[PDB]
Design a protein around this nucleic acid. Structure first.
Ligand SMILES: [Mg+2]
Ligand SMILES: [Mg+2]
Ligand SMILES: [Mg+2]
Ligand SMILES: [Mg+2]
Lengths: 114, 199, 72, 193
RNA sequence: GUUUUUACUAAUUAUAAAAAAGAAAAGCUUAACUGCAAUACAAACAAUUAAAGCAGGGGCAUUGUCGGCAAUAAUGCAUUGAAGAAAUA
RNA sequence: UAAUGCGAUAAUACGCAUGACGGUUCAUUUUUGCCGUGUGUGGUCACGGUAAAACUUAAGAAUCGUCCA
RNA sequence: AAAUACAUAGCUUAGCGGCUAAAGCACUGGUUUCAUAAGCCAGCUAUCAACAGUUCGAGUCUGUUUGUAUUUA
RNA sequence: AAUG
């Protein structure tokens, strides 16, 4: 019962590793050509930012997950992006990824699964 | 209804069966040190000494000393910077476990290397090295002025300014300058200490 | 579905040492087990000294134990 | 807070016992050493006054309550033997890990086992079939035939009268059977050999 | 039918289906609808098979899916008879 | 793809750490056989296929073991 | 090789999905009798041709290998 | 209430 594939110009991707969570926004013109990444934010950037001001425990923490969502919201708002579609895979069910997605929805970004 | 398992017996290699027919010569401490220093890139430095047999206390000191020279002399990209960070993190941790086996020259080099490198200092590596060399007999018996010059310069950069240690080094540094040995480092340390005394 | 609260009780051993152990209920008086590890014969170390070894090696028969009942 | 929230055995294993095993049995890697994974407590119908292989759950509530007192965590009914039978079970079980596992072991060894009449040593370990992960595990099994030695079943003697016996299993991960015995000895549990 | 969770990934008469999928558990429900339908598979004909999309009233979500069931079998023309409703005479 | 991977409290701040040896799992179409179609007195014929089945020597990658010659 | 039935303690004979069992003769022990028969009392035979399946569970339902009738060539 |  796999559903047919639907092409979308803007998609959100997550890459969950042992140490960090990476979020990217990529624009596509056709499935046969490479995309162009417009946003590239990971918990590594948030950790370097918060640690200077507010001590955090480690990159994989609730404080950094919310910080990553906030930074993603600013970049999309500046570029006039308000709606994205999430790419679902094994990493999409990670607890860290789910926290970031919840924060993005509350901030105002409309994320669609289908 | 519960089956049980029998672990297969181990396979000991038969005696008088060479492990390899290739020519792999034996390496001593001197050869490893020469190999480590003769490195041009972080990747070569990382692979210059690996394994618990070669990555000993003396190898860790050599890596830190050579890393400082390469960092000062060259500018690196993101990938090479990550390689440099990995080298520093591993070498210090090895030193923190085999510190008691280090020699006088190795400790003097370690202090100098740590001062030059910009990464965060490990737990108390500098303090521990000072304590071992605080007997005041090793610096006096340090025949090689290079070790004394490195130690004096390292502390000056770190701003320790120990009254007892410096008082001992002053006559040694002046003697080295008179003998023309390690003039650059000895002069640099003396100038920095003189500036501190003025301030 | 709800786990019970675990309290602490004082248990006194044969050697006078005390241990705090979990218990569902609360007891004010210390509990004295009939037998403990130290008193039981199974929990005994097998390290023996040279003096003990010499005593075992040199033993002479003594049948007084059997003949005591006849004398009495 | 006048509550038992710590674990004596937990401190002993990691801060005292672990180093001694390393010296006795050197290994290349730190984590390569004996480890105690879990302890399982089971009560079946054959260990109770009830004489039937399959019994209703309401008849096993008392035994489930008994395990809760002993362990401090709720127990669960065993799965039915077949889909046809739904409301009948065949015993109760409970599994413990971590601090709760160590606390149970300490109380059992120090107080209950020494007061059991016919105890000499725990049997030798048995090696199970490796699972999909390929890890070899050994199990040590023994039973407690006098459950009325705990000081907890005295509040309501009539209620807990039918409690008779229980079975215990311990799972150990180690390189060889000798290592398993070394760990068991460190736990102060004599082994029958 | 549809949402949520995860130490699970089976079974059918038979079968290498299926991981953004299923099974089980928990909650709410009746789309197992009314009136139509481009275009195709197959096929002597009769019938048989798949189906985007439009309007109405609904279900669960909150903008996706639902016109019965993983799929491949569980059936019978016309006539005659009978029932519910509606329009005539 | 070192912002990697793995872990026996398994969580990730801490532990192992990218080299070197050893054992496993993955080019003249390697060139022979074989198969298919066409033609055929049953083969002194032609072309193609084998990422369907047998068959060569490497080089690399992924684990795993290891105080290292 | 075709077709329809049947293989149940020592022998006749219940049973044809909830556990693996009914009734009569035989056999064993006791009682009655001078003794033997009849009559009376209590017991005993894991009670289910052989193999492979279906089902939570089969003497019971489905196939195969054996034996016995009945009809046909 | 058959038999020896
Ligand atoms: Mg037609
Ligand atoms: Mg809708
Ligand atoms: Mg459907
Ligand atoms: Mg006669």
């Amino acid at each position: 019962p796999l559903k047919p594939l639907v092409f979308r110009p803007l998609k959100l991707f997550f890459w969950a590793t042992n140490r960090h969570v990476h979020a990217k926004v990529v624009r596509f013109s056709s499935p046969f050509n490479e995309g162009v990444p417009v946003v590239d934010i990971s918990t590594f950037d948030a950790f370097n930012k918060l640690k200077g001001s507010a001590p955090v425990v480690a990159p994989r923490s609730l404080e950094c997950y919310k910080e990553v969502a906030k930074m993603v919201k600013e970049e999309t708002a500046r570029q006039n992006i308000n709606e994205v579609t999430l790419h679902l895979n094994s990493h999409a069910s990670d607890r860290g990824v789910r926290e970031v997605v919840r924060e993005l929805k509350n901030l105002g970004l409309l994320v669609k699964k289908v | 209804i519960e089956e049980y398992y029998v672990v297969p017996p181990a396979c000991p290699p038969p005696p008088h069966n060479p492990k390899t027919l290739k020519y792999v010569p034996k390496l001593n401490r001197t050869q490893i040190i020469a190999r480590v220093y003769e490195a041009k890139t972080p990747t070569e430095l990382e692979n210059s000494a690996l394994g618990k047999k070669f990555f000993s206390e003396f190898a860790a000191v050599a890596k830190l000393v050579r890393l400082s020279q390469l960092r000062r002399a060259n500018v690196y990209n993101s990938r090479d910077d990550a390689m440099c960070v990995s080298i520093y993190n591993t070498s210090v941790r090895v030193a923190d476990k085999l510190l008691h086996l280090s020699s006088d020259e190795e400790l003097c080099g370690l202090i100098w290397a740590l001062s030059q490198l910009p990464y965060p200092e490990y737990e108390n590596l500098v303090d521990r090295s000072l304590q071992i060399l605080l007997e005041e007999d090793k610096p006096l018996k340090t025949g090689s002025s290079l070790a004394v010059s490195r130690a004096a310069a390292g502390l000056a950069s770190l701003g320790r300014w120990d009254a007892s240690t410096w008082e001992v080094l002053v006559p040694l540094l002046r003697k080295n300058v008179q003998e023309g040995k390690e003039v650059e480092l000895s002069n640099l340390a003396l100038g920095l200490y003189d500036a501190r005394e003025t301030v | 579905l709800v786990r019970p609260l675990t309290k602490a009780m004082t248990v006194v051993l044969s050697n006078g040492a005390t241990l705090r152990l979990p218990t569902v209920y609360a007891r004010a008086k210390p509990w004295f087990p009939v037998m403990d590890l130290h008193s039981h014969n199974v929990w005994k170390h097998k390290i023996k000294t040279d003096f003990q070894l010499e005593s075992e090696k040199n033993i002479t028969p003594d049948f007084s134990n059997f003949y005591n009942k006849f004398g009495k | 807070s006048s509550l038992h929230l710590t674990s004596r055995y937990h401190h002993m294993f990691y801060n005292v016992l672990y180093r001694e095993m390393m010296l006795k049995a050197p290994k290349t890697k730190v984590e390569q050493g004996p480890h105690l994974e879990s302890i399982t407590l089971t009560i079946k119908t054959t260990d109770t006054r009830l004489d039937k292989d399959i019994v209703d759950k309401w008849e096993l509530l008392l035994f489930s309550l008994a395990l809760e007192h002993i362990t401090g965590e709720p127990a669960a009914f065993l799965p039915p033997p077949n889909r046809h039978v739904a409301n009948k079970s065949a015993g109760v079980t409970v599994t413990l890990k971590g601090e709760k596992m160590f606390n149970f072991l300490e109380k059992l060894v120090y107080t209950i086992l020494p007061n059991q009449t016919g105890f000499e040593g725990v049997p030798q370990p048995k090696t199970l079939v490796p699972g999909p992960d390929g890890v070899v595990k050994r199990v040590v099994d023994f039973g407690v035939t006098n459950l009325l030695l705990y000081p907890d079943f005295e509040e309501h003697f009539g209620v807990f009268e039918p409690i008779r016996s229980m079975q215990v299993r311990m799972m150990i991960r180690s390189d060889s059977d000798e290592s398993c015995n070394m760990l068991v000895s460190g736990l102060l549990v004599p082994q029958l050999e």
